[PDB]
Design a binder for this molecule. Structure first.
Ligand SMILES: *c1ccnc(NCC[C@H](N)C(=O)O)c1
Length: 275
């Protein structure tokens, strides 16, 4: 029942069309689909085998080049699952296969059907005490209002996110009351806003690389604090900061290929606690 406790994870295999057709905020180097497929299999392995979570592996769909990023299509809090309306219209078909799996796990399903509301799960930070929803090109006020209406036990606040980013492109929960946050002025300005509207001031773990602030914190039975972070090969300066967590079981998980299409650690799984 502790924060970050999960029993199940929903993931989705990446399709071959990802390398060429997955949306990306910036032109860059060519995506190695084989290596990305390799890194995704290592990611699922950490959640499923190394950590014992019950993994629902959804099949790829070549017509949905971004279907690997299941986090955008669902926000899960306790037994309630919010099926979002992704801001990219072409991604909204990834919702059908996620809803089918979330109700087989017997969660209370709420679908964001409002044709004026968009929300990417990647814009939602759940601190265990409240929600923060980034207002980006993908997530609008209506979508944030619908999330607030879906989890009325928890406070919801919004924070402006700039450019083609998500909120969790520069932050994530690194532990109980611990927010990993980037060192840029953009990230610190957003954190300054979030700490303002909260009735609680969090501890922060500042990393020199915004993207490396995206980590997966987990509380596993008979293991305790577990954190998946980017490798020292990718972001050595931020990996050094994570090594300070002496009571965390640290796991380096690479994501260098999917990062080319703005894919981070939190985007590739929906974590669920089923008692
Ligand atoms: C995780 C964190 C931040 N943003 C995302 N979005 C997925 C990227 C995808 N190619 C897209 O929809 O742009 C995931």
């Amino acid at each position: 029942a502790a924060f970050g406790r999960a029993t199940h994870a929903v993931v989705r295999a990446l399709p071959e069309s990802l390398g060429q057709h997955a949306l990306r905020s910036a032109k860059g180097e060519e995506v190695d689909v084989a290596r990305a497929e390799r890194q995704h299999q290592l990611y699922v392995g950490v959640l499923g085998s190394k950590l014992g979570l019950q993994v629902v592996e959804l099949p790829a769909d070549e017509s949905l080049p971004d279907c690997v990023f299941v986090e955008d299509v669902a926000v899960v809090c306790e037994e309630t699952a919010l099926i979002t309306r992704p801001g990219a219209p072409s991604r909204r078909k990834e919702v059908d296969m996620m809803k089918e799996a979330l109700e087989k796990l017997q969660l209370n399903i709420v679908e964001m059907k409002d044709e004026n509301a968009t929300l990417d799960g990647g814009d939602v930070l759940f601190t265990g005490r409240e929600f923060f929803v980034g207002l980006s090109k993908r997530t609008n006020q209506r979508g944030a209002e619908i999330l607030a209406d879906t989890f009325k036990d928890y406070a919801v606040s919004t924070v402006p996110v700039a450019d083609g980013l998500h909120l969790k492109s520069f932050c994530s929960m690194a532990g109980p009351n611990l927010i990993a946050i980037g060192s840029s002025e953009s990230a610190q300005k957003a954190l300054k806003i979030m700490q303002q509207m909260s009735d609680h001031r969090y501890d922060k773990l500042t990393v020199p690389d915004d993207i490396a602030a995206n980590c997966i914190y987990l509380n596993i039975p008979n293991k305790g604090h577990v954190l998946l972070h980017r490798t020292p090969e990718e972001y050595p300066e931020s990996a050094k900061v994570y090594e300070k967590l002496k009571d965390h079981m640290l796991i380096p998980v690479s994501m260098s290929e999917l990062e080319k299409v703005d894919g981070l650690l939190t985007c590739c799984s929906v974590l669920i606690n089923k008692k």
